[PDB]
């Protein structure tokens, strides 16, 4: 039993929730609240510890973009602050290479970043790495065979179908084939040698379509669409299945959790979250 963690998110205001879903029995565990509320963050796990990165606290008394990095120990159920990023990054994308957390893009006010920076937990230090070729907020990130992919998002003016890939040895970004659909606020993950982009927002609608990128062919292909259109969703991969969590669908905040099985090319509903929300950080032990 590994768990699916969902941290923060939004419903009326940014949230402090940390909850864990157990797909074996379909129960949600209610864990130690985040120290500061935030939505538009991203989650990742390094060395057994859950990290919540960036986002923004949209509250009734204000909203403040976050440069925060905080670390959760599931064994102690305690959150600990880490050194912060060089800049606040709301609607950030994160991926892990070689035990290091890569913070990609995101916004600070009107500033849409192309910059990228890397945290080394052994030293509690962030350093800038090569920036992307495009400013991206609401960007989806996933890592496959130590290549990090930044997919879609919004550059301040237009939503994007473009994507690009980070090569760590050379510290260089290179463009990859663009997706078939413009997607900002998609869920992005990796499963069986493909990079998936699910849902998002194209400038006109919230989306239910899903497509994947085969690294071998350099082609994006559509797979089965989700039941519910959704943007600013959480996403993870657990035991060969993609889980999508919450999101906004143009009218309400979703509590639905759908699960994609690649063998059958079908989505099904699984135990929904304890409340509807968007902009969650998600990761899996």
């Amino acid at each position, epitope marked *: 039993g590994r768990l699916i963690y969902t941290a923060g998110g*939004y419903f009326r205001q940014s949230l402090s929730y940390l909850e864990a879903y157990n797909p074996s029995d379909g129960t949600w565990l209610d864990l130690a609240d985040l120290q500061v509320p935030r*939505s*538009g963050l991203a989650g990742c796990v390094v060395g057994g510890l859950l990290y919540a990165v960036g986002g923004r606290n*949209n509250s*009734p008394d*204000g*909203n403040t973009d976050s440069s925060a990095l905080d670390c959760y120990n599931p064994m102690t159920n305690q959150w600990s602050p880490c050194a912060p990023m060089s800049v606040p990054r709301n*609607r950030i994308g994160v991926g892990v290479i070689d035990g290091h957390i890569y913070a990609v893009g995101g*916004s600070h*006010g*009107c*500033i*849409h970043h192309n910059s990228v920076e890397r945290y080394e937990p052994e030293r509690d230090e962030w350093h800038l790495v090569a920036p992307m070729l495009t400013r991206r907020i*609401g960007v989806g990130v996933a890592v496959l065979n130590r290549l990090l992919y930044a997919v879609g998002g*919004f550059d*301040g*003016t237009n939503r994007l179908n473009s994507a690009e890939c980070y090569y760590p040895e050379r510290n260089e970004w290179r463009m990859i084939t663009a997706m078939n659909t413009i997607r*900002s*606020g998609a869920g992005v993950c990796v499963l069986h040698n493909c990079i998936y982009a699910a849902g998002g*927002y194209d*400038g*006109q*609608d*919230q989306l239910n379509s899903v497509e994947r990128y085969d690294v071998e062919t350099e082609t994006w292909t559509f797979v089965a669409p989700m039941k519910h259109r959704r*943007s*600013a969703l959480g996403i993870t991969v657990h035991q060969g299945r993609i889980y999508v969590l919450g999101g*906004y*669908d*143009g*009218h*309400t*905040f979703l509590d639905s959790v759908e699960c994609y099985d690649p063998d059958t090319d079908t989505w099904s509903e699984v135990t929904r979250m304890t409340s509807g929300r*968007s*902009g969650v950080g998600v990761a899996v032990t």
Partner: single-chain antibody
Framework: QLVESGGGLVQPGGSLRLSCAAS????????IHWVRQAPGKCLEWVAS????????LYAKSVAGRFTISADTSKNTAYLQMNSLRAEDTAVYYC??????????????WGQGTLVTVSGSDIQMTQSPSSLSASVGDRVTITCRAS??????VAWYQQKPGKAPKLLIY???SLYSGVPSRFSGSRSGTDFTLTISSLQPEDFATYYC?????????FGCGTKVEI
């Protein structure tokens, strides 16, 4: 087009729901903002919704009393206004908000609806408050931001009883449909709107807005008079 409705005359402590119905486009194809204007007063920004995340922002004066929402199936946005107070009295406008290099400007506005109920913000200082001119004049209007707003300034033209129209965004970019006689520049915190040669249809009130920092704020206008 946006057509508003849902206001009217009410008592303090009441509740109204304003409606903002879209025609010819989807209510989801942008941010939706509400802006209000008290009788003979300065524009005040009220609320916004981001259609990608669902997140709402509210002016401090209305937080926790007003709720902004979108309904995609009815193609109508709403502003639920609870615990109304006298100072809520105003013409309320809905508008689609256009992202220009990370900054939001309102490019399509509703006709406005009347609601009668009976600080650390960036100031944008507009002078003169009124200017008399003849057709053919070169006209210059100034707006000083109380602190740096980078280039996140827009200029709007408003004719009496009608919705503002976006002329310029990002300080100096002309919006489509705006004649080339209008131009805008920045010099630090001072923003100027120039009309090279005033035309009969140019007599109007002109307002500046900043959308650098929360909450967006407007100047109190310059009325260009015959």
């Amino acid at each position: 087009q946006l057509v508003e409705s849902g206001g009217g005359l009410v008592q303090p402590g009441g509740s109204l729901r304003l409606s903002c119905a879209a025609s010819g486009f989807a209510i989801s194809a942008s941010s939706i903002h509400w802006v209000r204007q008290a009788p003979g007063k300065c524009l005040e920004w009220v609320a916004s919704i981001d259609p990608e995340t669902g997140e709402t922002l509210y002016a401090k004066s209305v937080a926790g009393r007003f709720t902004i929402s979108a309904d995609t199936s009815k193609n109508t946005a709403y502003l639920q206004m609870n615990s109304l107070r006298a100072e809520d009295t105003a013409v309320y406008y809905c508008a689609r908000a256009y992202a220009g290099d990370g900054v939001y400007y309102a490019d399509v506005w509703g006709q406005g609806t009347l609601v009668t109920v009976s600080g650390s913000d960036i100031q944008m200082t507009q002078s003169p408050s009124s200017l008399s001119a003849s057709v053919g004049d070169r006209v210059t209007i100034t707006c000083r931001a109380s602190q740096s707003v980078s280039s996140a300034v827009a200029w709007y033209q408003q004719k009496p009883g009608k919705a503002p129209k976006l002329l310029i965004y990002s300080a100096s970019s002309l919006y489509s449909g705006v004649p080339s006689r209008f131009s805008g520049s920045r010099s630090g915190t001072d923003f100027t709107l120039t009309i090279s040669s005033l035309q009969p249809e140019d007599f109007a009130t002109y307002y500046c807005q900043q959308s650098y920092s929360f909450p967006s704020t407007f100047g109190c206008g310059t009325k260009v008079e015959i």
